[PDB]
């Protein structure tokens, strides 16, 4: 299941997932390729901040979908 993530700087990174995924285990990925502790995350689907408990099959996140990251470092 792949997905995308958006910064606010501009580009987008791309993100392996799995429908079941939890929001955290999410922000574990965008760590590992952007070097970003989770607490300084938030993700942003169609409008709405993700909570880190939650999986993305809870939002209807599906395939092709864009996350947006935002940061408070």
């Known amino acids: ?31 590992d390729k952007e070097x970003i502790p989770p607490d300084q995350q938030r993700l942003i689907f169609a409008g709405k901040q993700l909570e880190d408990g939650r999986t993305l099959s809870d939002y209807n996140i599906q395939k092709e979908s864009t996350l947006h990251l935002v940061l408070r470092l």
């Open 1 to 31: 299941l792949q997905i995308f993530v958006k910064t606010l700087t501009g580009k987008t990174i791309t993100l392996e997932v799995e429908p079941s995924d939890t929001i955290e285990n999410v922000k574990a990925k965008i760590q």
